[PDB]
Amino acid sequence: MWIGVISLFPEMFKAITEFGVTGRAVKHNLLKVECWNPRDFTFDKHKTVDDRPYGGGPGMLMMVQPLRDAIHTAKAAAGEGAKVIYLSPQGRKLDQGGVTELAQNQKLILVCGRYEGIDERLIQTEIDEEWSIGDYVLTGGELPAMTLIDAVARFIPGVLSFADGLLDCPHYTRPEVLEGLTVPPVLMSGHHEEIRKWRLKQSLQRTWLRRPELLEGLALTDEQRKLLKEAQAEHNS
Ligand SMILES: O=c1[nH]cnc2scc(-c3ccccc3)c12
């Protein structure tokens, strides 16, 4: 997968390109991240990348000309078939369904805003889709871009409970007893099918207790329905 990035702070992307599973994906050429910086497309002495909003108020916007030229250059490098994404709080809120959809693209270009964002007409003329990572306010689009890249990278062949839309079950490792708390005996049992069912029941229980709205979005199998009923009965005992 190839991801173009437009950012005033390309070095921030080292966080995903030099570390962990995404870092491995980049080193092994499974994932390519290529950055263009609007600062390199300025022509004035002081390499100005911001500009004043019409109508005044506080805050600056990204300057149109350097940003537009960086986008054009990215598009030219991507060739045909690249979807241009602007990350913003007015975008579609990212969720796992969204990620799986985004992961179908072989090529993406991600535009990272700073200051109060970008001129609305650039969204109209250059941007295909707008996406948010959540209903909170951040200082720039770079962390959101990295969040998206990380999420989609998991779908790239060779890189590696929300799979079934449920919260994860609890996990245990050594030691057997930790501050008086013991590992559930079923996990020490060796009984593969009992363990599978325990994990599924736990996942259903936690989704019900913590995020019951997520259960309304699922069509549970007969086994899931049984396990949920048993977990609800136990909770009510
Ligand atoms: O502030 C946010 N919250 C949630 N998602 C996102 S994606 C991009 C941004 C962003 C932040 C600052 C300026 C321009 C864009 C954002």
Question: Would you write up a description of this structure?
Answer:
S-adenosyl-L-methionine binds at residues 86, 113, 133-138. Keywords: Cytoplasm, Methyltransferase, S-adenosyl-L-methionine, Transferase, tRNA processing. It catalyses: guanosine(37) in tRNA + S-adenosyl-L-methionine = N(1)-methylguanosine(37) in tRNA + S-adenosyl-L-homocysteine + H(+). This is tRNA (guanine-N(1)-)-methyltransferase. Homodimer. With 237 residues, this protein is α/β, with parallel strands linked by helices. It has two domains: 1-162, SPOUT methyltransferase, trefoil knot domain (Alpha/beta knot), CATH 3.40.1280; 163-237, tRNA(m1g37)methyltransferase, domain 2 (Trp Operon Repressor, Chain A), CATH 1.10.1270. The chain has ten helices and nine strands. It has helices at 14-17, 20-27, 64-78, 96-102, 120-126, 142-153, 185-189, 192-210, 212-216, 222-235, and strands at residues 2-6, 32-36, 50-51, 61-62, 83-93, 107-111, 129-132, 177-178, 181-182. The strands form three sheets. A five-stranded parallel beta sheet has the order 2-1-6-5-7. Strands 3-4 form a two-stranded antiparallel sheet. It has a two-stranded antiparallel sheet with strand order 8-9. Helix 4 links the parallel strand 5 (83-93) and strand 6. The radius of gyration is 23 Å and the shape is elongated. 25% of the residues are buried. The structure holds 5-phenylthieno[2,3-d]pyrimidin-4(3H)-one. 5-phenylthieno[2,3-d]pyrimidin-4(3H)-one (22L) binds at residues 87-89, 113-114, 117, 132-134, 136-141, 144.
